[PDB]
Paper text:
[name] expresses a type IV protein secretion system (T4SS) that promotes contact-dependent killing of other bacteria and does so partly by secreting the effector [name]. Here, we report the structure of [name], comprising an N-terminal domain similar to the catalytic domain of glycosyl hydrolase (GH-19) chitinases and a C-terminal domain for recognition and translocation by the T4SS. Thus, [name] is comprised of a fold similar to that of characterized GH-19 chitinases/endolysin. Furthermore, the SPN1S protein’s apical head-like domain is important for interactions with peptidoglycan. These analyses demonstrate that [name] shares significant structural homology with GH-19 enzymes and may target a component of bacterial cell walls.
As a result, we determined the structure of [name] to 1.9 Å. There are two molecules of [name] in the asymmetric unit. Each protomer consists of 12 α helices, 2–310 helices, and 3 β sheets and forms two domains. The N-terminal domain is composed of two helical bundles. Helical bundle A (η1–η2, α3–α6) forms an apical head-like region that is linked to bundle B (α1, α2, α8, and α9) by long helix α7 and loop 2 (L2 connects α2 and η1). These helical bundles connect to create a cleft or concave groove that consists primarily of residues from L2 and loop 3 (L3) that connects α5 and α6 and protrudes down into this groove. The C-terminal domain is composed of a single helical bundle (α10, α11, and α12) adjacent to a three-stranded, anti-parallel β-sheet. Structural overlay of [name] to that of these GH-19 enzymes showed that residues Glu34 and Glu43 of [name] align with the catalytic Glu residues of the well-characterized chitinases. However, Val111 aligns with the Ser/Thr residue of the conserved GH-19 catalytic triad. The Ser-to-Val substitution in the catalytic triad of [name] and numerous non-conserved amino-acid substitutions in the substrate binding motif suggested that this effector possibly targets a substrate other than GlcNAc or chitin.
Residue numbers in the entry: 1 to 316
């Protein structure tokens, strides 16, 4: 599914010389955001909230009402009028129908007749006459790498904010791009990069990682604080298995890390036995920090999931 198209794009990118894990994560974050994880290879002309969502200033040149009428027509499957407002008379879209014919396609959307002309010439693809080729995953990958290597200067290859600006001349969805960037930085380990260099099909293997219950792993300090305090509660902790105690410690360390605690000094039961509160500092300290977990959900919450979420949280 997404894994197959993501693996294909990772191989195409590394085959084109995008070898830096930092540059590759950035490239993958921009492509993932602009195509919703490589699942949307065609531009959507559907705007359900309002015309304020339409990101092209030029679309208002015929007044607010003509733009609202084109929006309703696009929602009914006739986006020609909206495409003409958004891209007509720009980027080589001279003839009627060009704006929609050359709508965005690909991972780093190719839009406008002149960009289909330039990309076609550079990649030996008949994109002007068969623009649909730009929405085919294989060609889409080659076109995204070309957009990246020709529109992003070397100095902006490692920064999500600068790369987004060099690509789009504006900063849209920076939060979502930053989140995708941090996920790719975690996935592109040395062995994953080595398997991409070797050209392996399933190179992006995640593999079993050590959980926070192992010494030296991210969250281990908070995990041991939680585990010690759970064992101190004795039979009153309501935990009937070592596995449930470990799961609860993992959930507690995660909540603690998310709320800014560096240490769990105390564990308190509350909400009629349904909640566990992790506390940093004495209970009478007005600077005391706190975090809470649902006891039932925490006893069955995977320690591998808790360890993954805490590691990402610390990396953020």
């Amino acid at each position: 599914m997404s894994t197959d198209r993501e693996s294909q794009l990772l191989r195409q990118a590394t085959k084109a010389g995008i070898d830096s894990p930092l540059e590759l994560a950035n490239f993958m974050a921009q492509a993932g955001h602009e195509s919703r994880g490589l699942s949307r290879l065609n531009e959507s002309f559907n705007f359900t909230r309002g015309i304020s969502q339409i990101p092209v200033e030029a679309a208002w040149r015929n007044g607010n009402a003509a733009l609202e009428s084109a929006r309703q027509e696009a929602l009914r499957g006739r986006p020609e009028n909206l495409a003409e407002l958004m891209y007509g008379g720009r980027m080589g879209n001279d003839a009627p129908g060009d704006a929609l014919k050359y709508h965005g396609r690909g991972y780093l959307p190719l839009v406008g007749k002149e960009n289909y002309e330039r990309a076609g010439k550079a990649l030996d693809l008949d994109l002007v006459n068969q623009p649909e080729l730009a929405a085919q995953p294989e060609h889409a990958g080659r076109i995204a790498v070309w957009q990246w290597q020709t529109r992003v200067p070397e100095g902006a290859r490692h920064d999500v904010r600068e790369a987004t600006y060099a690509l789009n001349g504006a900063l849209n969805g920076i939060e979502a791009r930053r989140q995708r960037f941090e996920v790719w930085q975690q996935k592109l380990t040395p062995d994953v990069m080595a398997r991409l260099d070797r050209g392996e099909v399933g190179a992006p293997a995640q593999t079993v990682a050590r959980d926070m219950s192992h010494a030296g792993e991210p969250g281990n300090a908070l995990f041991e604080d939680a585990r010690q305090h759970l064992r101190q509660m004795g039979p009153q902790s309501g935990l009937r298995s070592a596995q449930e105690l470990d799961n609860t410690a993992g959930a507690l360390a995660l909540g603690a890390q998310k709320a800014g605690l560096s240490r769990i000094d105390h564990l308190l039961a509350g909400n009629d036995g349904r909640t566990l509160f992790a506390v940093q500092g004495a209970l009478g300290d007005p600077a005391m920090l706190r975090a809470s977990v649902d006891r039932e959900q925490a006893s069955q919450q995977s320690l591998a999931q808790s360890s993954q979420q805490l590691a990402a949280s610390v990396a953020q």
